[PDB]
Curated annotation (Swiss-Prot):
Function of the protein: Beta-oxidation of fatty acids. The highest activity concerns the C6 to C10 chain length substrate.
Assigned GO CC terms: mitochondrion; peroxisome
Name this protein carries in UniProt: Peroxisomal carnitine O-octanoyltransferase
Cross-referenced InterPro entries: Carn_acyl_trans (IPR000542), Carn_acyl_trans_N (IPR042572), CAT-like_dom_sf (IPR023213), Cho/carn_acyl_trans (IPR039551), Cho/carn_acyl_trans_2 (IPR042231)
Organism: Mus musculus (Mouse)
Biological processes annotated in GO: carnitine metabolic process; coenzyme A metabolic process; fatty acid beta-oxidation; fatty acid metabolic process; fatty acid transport; generation of precursor metabolites and energy; medium-chain fatty acid metabolic process
């Protein structure tokens, strides 16, 4: 069995029935509307269904006839590439490497040695992929799309004036040649080197030589031009700064391309985030913030190394979702566990070419841009608050409802929530929106705060909420959700120069979350001991992510300090209290 053998067999992303999607939409706005607003929306939806919507839907079906995935390109552009805000901080997702839970606890002076093994394991994963030896993900006996794995290595974003682009240079052995070098950033400088020698991959000791070399050289020398810091800027500014950089020297492009084509970017930081199995929220903060001088935010995969021997990953959310990062990080985690975090092979260090430094040609302007880039990222990142804790009826649904209750209790009202649903059953399927703030969820939350509510009433309603969310997650993962569907109708209109349907201008459309207005941006990040996170979707919102282990729930929450109403720490405390009451409710109900 080969990694991508089932791709030509995957079913097309479906287009839900118009009536079904509109019914689900109407039901979803109920929690945020009074009698009058709902009647208005109902009439808007009915007309849409009878006229313009019916026609736009037909055109969407026509699009699906010629594309195995009618949404792919649109989603990439609309959700990511066209967006102009700084993507490095506001869109990229990050995740700590969970090695400090065992063999690699935080400790000074272990950065280079542990780093050599980190590269080695990461690189062996690339070898697996290139040879298509990586196991095919399946749900029972049904194969899942594996395309996102092609975006892990040798992939990088390039800024555009109005639209960015993704460069995917990865290729399997059967497809052709794949770049074989990695890029290292240190003290505002960039270096590169081939990971292969005499046919095989270089070993940790050999990798430790390259890294040690780079570290020593830069340590007692002034910080370099830090061209990398420009990747953390507003997309259009970066696009222009990039063009200017290239004009100063045609060669500068060659350097940019070298970074773009590298298997991945490895970053050396001098900071040391507090990382212990108990508290490690600081790892998330330095991962999203850190020092721009050594990060390449356009890279699909940027492995980060801290001074205290801690590691983390920062990824461009555009080309793929967090599950690929989770899988390689877990693979590495298993390797570390098997080897007790040590290299026990030959200590021989063959004579391999030293790392080559990438020296860009810059003037006074470029340096001012770099200076400006660093400052804006640091200032913006400093407003980020991260709360990470561990807590010790599907678990995901349990957590989603617990969050509904926590937000309801903390803020006094239902929080429109976005939960990621994977659609990998389909060709190049990525995500769909699951709207956790349902009528059922709210009815339950009210009963939990109702003193006159009986124990049986609360359990009964909690179960009805569970049932609703389960059906929701199922339909969405099966391509029967409605959020992407409505986006498709909207895009059909725009693409032909036709007016925006009234349905999208409706106050309830955005109040329920449409248009990227979810006060709770969430997703399960798997069951592989890796955690991920992104900043909130809205200024007065939260980012809430989590992963599940057989004996615990791990969570990561983000909020903006500049928003006095939100507090990541307080919300986490509230959801833990929520888990408790929900457990007790089931136990006492057990009877």
């Amino acid at each position: 069995e080969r990694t991508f053998q089932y791709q030509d067999s995957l079913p097309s992303l479906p287009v839900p029935a118009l009536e079904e999607s509109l019914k689900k939409y109407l039901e979803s706005v109920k929690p945020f509307a009074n009698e009058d607003e709902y009647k208005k929306t109902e009439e808007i939806v009915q007309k849409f269904q009878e006229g313009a919507g019916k026609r736009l839907h037909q055109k969407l079906l026509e699009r699906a006839r010629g594309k195995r995935n009618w949404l792919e390109e649109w989603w990439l552009n609309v959700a990511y590439l066209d967006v102009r805000i700084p993507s490095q901080l506001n869109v990229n997702f990050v995740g700590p490497c969970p090695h400090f839970e065992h063999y690699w606890p935080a400790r000074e002076g272990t950065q280079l040695e542990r780093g050599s093994m980190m590269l080695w394991h990461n690189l062996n994963y690339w070898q697996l992929l290139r040879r298509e030896k990586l196991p095919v993900h399946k749900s029972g006996n049904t194969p899942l799309d594996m395309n996102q794995f092609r975006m892990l290595f040798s992939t990088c974003k390039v800024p555009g004036i109005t639209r960015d682009s993704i460069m995917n240079y990865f290729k399997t052995e059967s497809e052709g040649h794949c770049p074989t070098h990695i890029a290292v950033l240190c003290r505002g400088r960039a270096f590169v080197f081939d990971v292969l020698h005499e046919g095989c991959l270089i070993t940790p000791p050999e990798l430790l030589r390259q890294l040690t070399y780079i570290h020593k050289k830069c340590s007692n020398e002034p910080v370099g031009p830090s061209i990398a810091a420009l990747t953390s800027e507003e997309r259009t500014r970066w696009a222009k700064a990039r063009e200017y950089l290239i004009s100063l020297d045609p060669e500068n492009l060659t350097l940019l391309e070298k970074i773009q084509t590298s298997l991945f970017v490895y970053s050396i930081e001098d900071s040391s985030p507090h990382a212990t199995p108990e508290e490690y929220s600081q790892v998330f903060e330095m991962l999203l913030g850190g020092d721009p001088s050594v990060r390449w935010g356009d890279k699909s995969y940027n492995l980060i190394s801290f001074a205290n021997g801690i590691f983390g990953m920062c990824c461009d959310h555009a080309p793929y979702d967090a599950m690929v990062m989770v899988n390689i990080a877990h693979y590495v985690d298993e390797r570390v566990l098997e080897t007790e975090g040590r290299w026990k092979g030959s200590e021989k260090v063959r004579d391999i070419p030293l790392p080559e430094e990438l020296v860009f040609t810059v003037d006074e302007k470029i340096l001012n841009d770099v200076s400006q880039a660093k400052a804006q990222h640091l200032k913006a990142a400093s407003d980020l608050q991260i709360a990470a804790s561990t807590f010790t009826l599907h678990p995901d649904t349990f957590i989603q409802l617990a969050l509904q209750l926590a937000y309801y209790r903390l803020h006094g009202r239902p929080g429109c929530c976005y939960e990621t649903a994977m659609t990998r059953y389909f060709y190049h399927g990525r995500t769909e929106t699951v709207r956790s703030c349902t009528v059922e969820a709210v009815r339950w939350c009210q009963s939990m705060q109702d003193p006159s509510a009986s124990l049986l009433e609360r359990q009964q309603k909690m179960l009805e909420a569970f049932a609703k969310h389960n059906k929701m997650m199922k339909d969405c993962s099966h391509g029967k959700g409605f959020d992407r569907h409505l986006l498709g109708l909207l895009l059909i209109a725009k693409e032909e120069g036709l007016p925006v349907p009234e349905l999208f201008e409706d106050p309830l459309f955005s109040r329920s979350g449409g248009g990227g207005n979810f006060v709770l941006s969430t997703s399960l990040v798997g069951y592989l001991r890796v955690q991920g996170v992104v900043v909130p979707m809205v200024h007065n919102g939260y980012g809430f992510f989590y992963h599940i282990r057989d004996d615990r729930f791990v969570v990561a929450c983000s909020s903006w300090r500049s928003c006095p109403e939100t507090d990541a720490e307080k919300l986490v405390q509230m959801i833990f209290h929520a888990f408790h009451d929900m457990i007790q409710l089931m136990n006492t109900a057990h009877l």
